[PDB]
Structure formats: structure tokens, C-alpha cells
Design a protein around this ligand. Structure first.
Ligand code: YFB
Length: 263
């Protein structure tokens, strides 16, 4: 049953999905098509060891560092994409500029792991825009403290992926994440909360329409925000270890600024 209020929520859902498609070149639908073999043309090259890795660059420093810095570079790009998406969220750019920065500072990593789940199955992760696939085992076999960095992301991904969200659901969910009025140091919480409220209403309707047979999906999805926050905490601690153990390893300033005084 459609009414004018439901109609505005659908309109918002459509706008967010449209903006999501425009902002994120590699969607879940593409990632799944690559992962599941809808394919002769979308076949990833698979990196599972040093040789395959060495063969990969065809399609300077220690291996773990190269992978970690490759992972950091994609994060920077993901931040850029998520920032572009944030601006499309109605009301977002009208917020106090300090709050805009705060929302992004705290939101982007949670979004990164949400969307990274789209690129994952239990066996590994799509890399280089889906051209490559790096196995979970190969990542886990990396010298300490690098063998540990991706494992919590995979753990989250397999459980998050069981919700079977599609991109149209995800567009609203990551907008909800960004407009969190509970971020530290926010100047004006009310206008953020009002937008989140609307986004939440939109997400709820979207899940009810897109997944009618999936009971309490909305609640189950919101509960995942806990898993995301914990992933972020561990990551930052692991980064502190890296800083001290790999003094010769540069961290991208954008990421360094984001990490500066997190929770
Ligand atoms: C294992 O983590 C890597 C490593 C890499 C580096 C793999 C690599 C390393 C050395 C030489 C060739 C390839 C990439 C990449 O290059 O695209 C990558 O996308 C990832 C995925 C991980 C992330 C945290 C990126 C998050 C991305 C999104 C939310 C869209």
C-alpha cells in the first residue's frame, strides 16, 4: 500500500540508490557476478601465494608491506567515494561544516568494512576493481602483524553477507551510518538525528519491500553496527602496532587524520 509519506520514503530510497551507483564504481551486484562466475569476461586472476602475487602485477619492498600499502591506497579511494556519496545524502551538506567532517571521520571506516563485505566471500576478497581475487589464507599467512589485519573483516563479511542485502538496501544503510548523531565532538546533534530518522524510516520500508520474507531484517541490520564499530577499534590498535614496529612504513595522511583521536 502506497501513501504520500511512504511515497517520499521510496523517492528517497531511489535517490540514494541512484547516487550510490554513481559514487561506487564496483557495486555488490558486480562483485557477486564476478565471485559467482556469471562469467568468461569477468574472471579474476587469483592471488593465493608469492608466485601468483608476482604474476598478478602483470594484469620494491617486502610482500606484506606492499599488500598493506595497496590496501591503504584503496581505502583512500574508498574514502573519496564515500565522501562523494555523503554529499548526495539530503541535508548532509547543509550541516555545520565541522559536523560534516566529524560524520565522515567516524563514518567512513564503518562504511568501508560494510562495503568491503560486498567484495568478500569466505575464501577471499576482490581486489583491483574486481580484476583480482586475493585469498583469505594467503592474507592470513602474512608475517605478523600483517597476517592478522584482514581476518576480522572476513569474519564480519561472512555474517553480514548472510543478510543478503543488495546495493539498493546498502545505499540506505550506509547513509544511516554516516548520519549518526552519536559521533564524538558533534556540535549540533538534532539536525543529524532528524536526517537519520528519515533515513531509518526509508531503510525500514526498503527492507520490508525488498525482503518481505526476511523477518526483523531491519533490527538484524542495525545490530551489525556493533560489529562494525568493533572492527574499527581493532584495526586502529593494529595500526598503532604497525606505526611502532614498521617505522619505515608511511601511512597516508588522509587515513592518519581520520585515525587521529578515534574513540
Ligand atoms: C587485502 O586488502 C586489499 C589489498 C589490496 C592490495 C593487493 C595487492 C598488493 C600488492 C600487489 C598487488 C595487489 C587491494 C587492492 O590492491 O585493490 C584491496 O582492494 C584490498 C581490499 C581491502 C580494503 C580494506 C579496501 C576496501 C575497499 C572497499 C570498501 C571498496
Amino acid at each position: 500500500q502506497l501513501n504520500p509519506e511512504s511515497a517520499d520514503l521510496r523517492a528517497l530510497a531511489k535517490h540514494l540508490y541512484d547516487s550510490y551507483i554513481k559514487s561506487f564504481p564496483l557495486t555488490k551486484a558486480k562483485a557477486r557476478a564476478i565471485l559467482t562466475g556469471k562469467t568468461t569476461d569477468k574472471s579474476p586472476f587469483v592471488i593465493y601465494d608469492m608466485n601468483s602475487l608476482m604474476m598478478g602485477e602483470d594484469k620494491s619492498k617486502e610482500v606484506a608491506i606492499r599488500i598493506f600499502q595497496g590496501c591503504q591506497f584503496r581505502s583512500v579511494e574508498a574514502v573519496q567515494e564515500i565522501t562523494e556519496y555523503a554529499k548526495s545524502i539530503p541535508g548532509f551538506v547543509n550541516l555545520d561544516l565541522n559536523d560534516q567532517v566529524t560524520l565522515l571521520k567516524y563514518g567512513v571506516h564503518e562504511i568501508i568494512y560494510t562495503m568491503l563485505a560486498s567484495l568478500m566471500n569466505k575464501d577471499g576478497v576482490l581486489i583491483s576493481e574486481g580484476q583480482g581475487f586475493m585469498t583469505r589464507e594467503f592474507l592470513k599467512s602474512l608475517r605478523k602483524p600483517f597476517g592478522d589485519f584482514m581476518e576480522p573483516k572476513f569474519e564480519f563479511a561472512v555474517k553480514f553477507n548472510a543478510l543478503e542485502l543488495d546495493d539498493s538496501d546498502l545505499a540506505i544503510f550506509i547513509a544511516v551510518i554516516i548520519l549518526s548523531g552519536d559521533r564524538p565532538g558533534l556540535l549540533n546533534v538534532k539536525p543529524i538525528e532528524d536526517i537519520q530518522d528519515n533515513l531509518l524510516q526509508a531503510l525500514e520500508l526498503q527492507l520490508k519491500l525488498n525482503h518481505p520474507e526476511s523477518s526483523q531484517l531491519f533490527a538484524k541490520l542495525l545490530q551489525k553496527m556493533t560489529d562494525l564499530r568493533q572492527i574499527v577499534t581493532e584495526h586502529v590498535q593494529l595500526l598503532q602496532v604497525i606505526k611502532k614496529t614498521e617505522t619505515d612504513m608511511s601511512l597516508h595522511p588522509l587515513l592518519q587524520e581520520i585515525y587521529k583521536d578515534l574513540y
